[PDB]
Design a protein around this ligand. Structure first.
Ligand SMILES: [Zn+2]
Lengths: 129, 52, 134, 149
RNA sequence: GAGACCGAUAGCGCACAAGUAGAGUGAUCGAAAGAUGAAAAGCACUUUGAAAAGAGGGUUAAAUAGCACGUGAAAUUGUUGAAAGGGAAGCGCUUGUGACCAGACUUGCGCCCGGCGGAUCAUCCGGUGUUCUCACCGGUGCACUCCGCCGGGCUCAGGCCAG
RNA sequence: GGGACCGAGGACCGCGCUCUGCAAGGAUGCUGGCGUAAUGGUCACCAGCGACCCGUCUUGAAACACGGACCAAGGAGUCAAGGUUUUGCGCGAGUGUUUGGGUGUAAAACCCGCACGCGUAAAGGUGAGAGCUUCGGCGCAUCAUCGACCGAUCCUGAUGUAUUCGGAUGGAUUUGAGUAGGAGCGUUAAGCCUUGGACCCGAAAGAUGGUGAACAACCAUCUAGUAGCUGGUUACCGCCGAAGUUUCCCUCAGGAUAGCAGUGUCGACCUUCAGUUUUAUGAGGUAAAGCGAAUGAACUUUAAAUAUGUAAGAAGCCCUUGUUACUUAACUGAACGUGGGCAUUCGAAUGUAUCGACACUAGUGGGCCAUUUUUGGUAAGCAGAACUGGCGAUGCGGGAUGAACCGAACGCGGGGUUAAGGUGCCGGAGUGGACGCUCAUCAGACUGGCGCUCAAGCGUCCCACCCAUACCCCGCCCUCAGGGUAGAAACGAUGCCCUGAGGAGUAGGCGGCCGUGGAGGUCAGUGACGAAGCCUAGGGCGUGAGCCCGGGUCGAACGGCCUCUAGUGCAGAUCUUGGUGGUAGUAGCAAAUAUCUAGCGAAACCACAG
């Protein structure tokens, strides 16, 4: 669209960055990330550690998980695998459990610098309603 | 910025159609017909024309 | 954090801002190279900046601001004396503002030109009012 | 205008008065224009009418935009896959109805013609046979084109 | 003791003679009404006349602030000036006439000589503050350079409207 | 060759050409004029054309009705509590400090011990599918389908059992606000609903407690009572924009559902979709022609016109073989499993600035006219059905006013050309041209008046001309859409640049902007060398609400910007208060203070005028 509804200035910074990327690269990943950055909070539901742990199963354990939402901790998950996740926000228990398992935590600008086009990324959405 | 009529502006016509200069030079618009004595209309056609 | 302070200045409040109803905003900051509130001309939201100012003595200086003194508000600007020769002053601006944005260089040359023209006009006006006595 | 003839006129890209389109004479299209005869006047153009229509009032549909055909590069860029690379190929494909007549005629924006110099007939909302202007005038349409272009 | 309250048709009915004036047999009902000036210095005196009134004259920074008193809108009215009209006036678009008012580009720069005076000129000296290499003072002089000022010379650029 | 109107843009880039530069991606050159006035503006008057009095309400529409003597000030969707939807924000399987305690520079801010409220607890296959890819594939969310588990229900009824308790195995067309890797809590802003005076004003009443009399009345309160039904309901601009219907239920006094308008999400994306033609097809073989063919509109070889359903490949085709809970005598069919090849006419036309689903939200349920088809009756009109188009909610050109009807639908301008209608005058444009007819004691006019008669009437034909907001070309405004713009720009990426299309509008929805009182911050803001206010046949800016400056008066405060807040914007309510008028120096000398002439002196009524 024309403007994000968010008043977070850093969100608008991410929107400017991914507008530039979507314009100057032929990568559908950047366009999808920009579209999800424009979207509202109810349309960006929280993604739990267990849902990522399920999706990191076949050959995606070496891929970088990208979540345009907040990753939340799941108490049902007893063992957290090693994971490189790039998300808007992390809850304190989720970030602590990811880093305690040898994994890593990323923001979207570090993703845009390390992976400008989204090569070998795993885009994950949270459950609707 | 400004559409120019090729029928009024000869340079625009030469830009779109490079053949216009030699179409006008060789007079292909004033071409003459084939020479030789033309035959006369058949009488059958004339009697059909002025029938009853 | 140039962008973040720019968003805070531009979208919320700036004490140096003059909002006019005629289609342009103005910058009341003394170190603004053009007295206009826009992204390139902001002396605060740009960490590296350059302007041209004239002292009460009449000597015109070039003021340069870097990011490494940004936490030092008393040491923000370095002051370099510009020559009375106009072409040599233009080359001094070109030499000191090498590798700067072209907007800052262009506006610095324009401000130096306008300051020298104002000085010449002031001398002519002072001569005319001295002659007339009005 | 009843909804069915108005649907026909929207299908023929005639949504405004004094609007001209080139239609390939096909019995389906023939039945369509016989349906909307109370609103249109149509006939067989010669080479002069097509030439002056495309040269003077020729506008192309480039990305849904009405672009004047002031250069051959536009025609090559929009119709180069069909062999039409300049304006003379466009005139040849419209006049002599070739294999790619759909795309050549659809590329052209509908011709926004002026009112006729000299006016219409004294009662133009009547068929051409009954001394009007509606319906099929055949070759006489050239004169109408010469008045409206 | 206070307020993101109200500011004299508001805020309590009542900022002032207010449960007063006034009404009703009575129970009861119940208004309107603030501001001269810093200071009364609240207009002496002369002169009309019977007035809650004038003319001179005076106080005052001011009286076109005179206890009708800070400012003083509109409705409505009078004097003077101009124009129009007598089977409606008023309005929209477009010229004209008369009267009045405003006043167009704020109207400049560059070269070439001669003289003068300063400097960022002098690999001149001394001092001060500094972001430690940049600024600012004081004293020297015009070989060079650069600025100005004065007297001459020349070129150029200039706002609007017509053909 | 003659004329008119226009000159958008602003270094270069491009296509080109008649190539030493050109008429080739938008006007320059030369000359002249301009300060005791070039050029503007204001007021008054004259002149040409145009123009029903505003608001409310009813009607299909009018027409009536209501309100309006004038001016100033005041004047009406508010505040709580409880639900619900959406935007932002913090934390997140948790969240919420503010009952309270501690603390304090003291109603602020800062901290939190135990509770409590709400919520959470008590991973399967296949096929699509965004995205990624080492080109082999991996596959989010979501949907479809086949499965798994559970509260509980239907039988079969295990080892066992205290000997009268239990449910193991195999079966069911099972359900659920069930599970199948949590989404909530708090707050802010906006909208809607319920209740409180509840957008503002407006009964008859009823009750409680008092005051008087003299054959029920009055006063105060409950009470801002309540029911219907009126009247009124406050700046501008922009964008989008209706319905007056389907179905259901029951009060009569009505709601729900869907439809028209809009928002968000998901899925594709000119794939697909269509008030459409064509092909085949449905009811009309309806008209016609022939019957030197048969037979007899009902005859037919052929076949109209005219309208209206269905299908036009990938969500597809065909055939062969197993299963099923179905079906029939029977793969007789149906469904679930088969296989093949067709992506370079993938299987008509044309258009395509897109469509479907899910969820959420305002306003509306009139009727009238006309057409097509059909039925019935009357002396004649007329009555009953479906249909679209319009009006309500529409301006402009014509139409003698209107209305209907014809044209054509609307941003601000310049030029050109027309539609309907016109060219004797009013009135712009022909006393135009060809052929005939008509003299009417109130002819006739594709007449309104004057008037017209080898027309200025009638019928046909031909030529030129006139002008709508219509069409075409250019300029400008706005909206929408497409494109470009970072080792950053020669303009706030909420900026800038390029291109195209479009512009009516009631109820209603959304956005932007102007103004008022007060609060926090700021402008090192203005000001007794003059703030605010007011007046003003001055000057500017803005489409507009409005804003800025000059001149006069005046005498103490005030303004801009970013946020916050509200008792925030008036033409009307037989609105409230105050002030002031025509009537009118009139009626009359009346309460208060039979005529003429002094002095005194109203009221009804009043949109503006006959
Ligand atoms: Zn600024």
């Amino acid at each position: 669209r024309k403007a994000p509804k968010s008043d977070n200035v850093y969100l608008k910074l991410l929107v400017k960055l991914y507008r530039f990327l979507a314009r100057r690269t032929e990568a559908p990943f950047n366009k999808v990330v920009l579209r999800r950055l424009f979207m509202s909070r109810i349309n960006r539901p929280p993604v739990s550690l267990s849902r990522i742990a399920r999706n990191l199963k076949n050959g995606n354990e070496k891929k970088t998980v990208v979540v345009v939402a907040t990753v939340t901790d799941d108490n049902r998950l007893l063992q957290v695998p090693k994971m490189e996740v790039a998300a808007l926000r992390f809850t304190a228990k989720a970030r602590a459990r990811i880093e305690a398992a040898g994994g890593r935590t990323l923001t979207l600008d570090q993703l845009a610098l390390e992976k400008p086009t989204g090569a070998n990324t795993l885009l994950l959405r949270g459950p609707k309603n | 910025v400004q559409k120019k009529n090729p029928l009024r502006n000869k340079q625009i016509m030469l830009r779109l159609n490079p053949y216009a200069s030699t179409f006008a030079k060789e007079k292909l618009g004033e071409v003459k017909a084939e020479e030789g004595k033309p035959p006369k209309v058949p009488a059958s056609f004339k009697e059909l024309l002025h029938e009853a | 954090s140039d962008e973040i302070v720019w968003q805070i200045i531009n979208q919320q409040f700036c004490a140096f801002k003059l909002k006019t109803t005629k289609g342009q905003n103005f910058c009341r900051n003394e170190y603004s190279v053009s007295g206009l509130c826009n992204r390139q001309s902001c002396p605060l939201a740009n960490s590296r900046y350059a302007t041209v100012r004239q002292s009460p003595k009449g000597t015109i200086y070039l003021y340069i601001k870097t990011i490494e003194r940004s936490h030092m508000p008393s040491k923000w600007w370095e002051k370099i004396k510009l020559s009375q020769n106009y072409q040599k002053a233009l080359e001094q601006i070109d030499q000191r503002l090498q590798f700067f944005p072209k907007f800052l260089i262009h506006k610095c040359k324009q401000r130096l030109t306008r300051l020298v023209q104002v000085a010449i006009r002031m001398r002519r006006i002072a001569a005319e009012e001295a002659r007339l006595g009005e | 205008i009843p909804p069915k003839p108005r649907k026909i006129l929207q299908l023929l890209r005639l949504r405004q008065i004094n609007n001209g389109v080139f239609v390939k004479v096909t019995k389906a299209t023939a039945e369509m224009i016989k349906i909307v005869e109370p609103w249109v006047a149509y006939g067989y153009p010669n080479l002069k009418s097509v030439r002056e229509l495309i040269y003077k009032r020729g506008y192309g549909k480039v990305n849904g935009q009405r672009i004047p055909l002031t250069d051959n590069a536009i025609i090559e860029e929009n119709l180069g896959k069909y062999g039409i690379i300049c304006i003379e190929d466009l005139i040849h494909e419209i006049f002599t109805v070739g294999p790619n007549f759909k795309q050549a005629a659809n590329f052209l924006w509908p011709f926004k013609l002026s009112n006729p110099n000299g006016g219409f007939r004294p009662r133009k909302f009547k068929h051409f046979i009954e001394g009007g202007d509606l319906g099929n005038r055949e070759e006489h349409i050239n004169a109408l084109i010469r008045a409206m272009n």
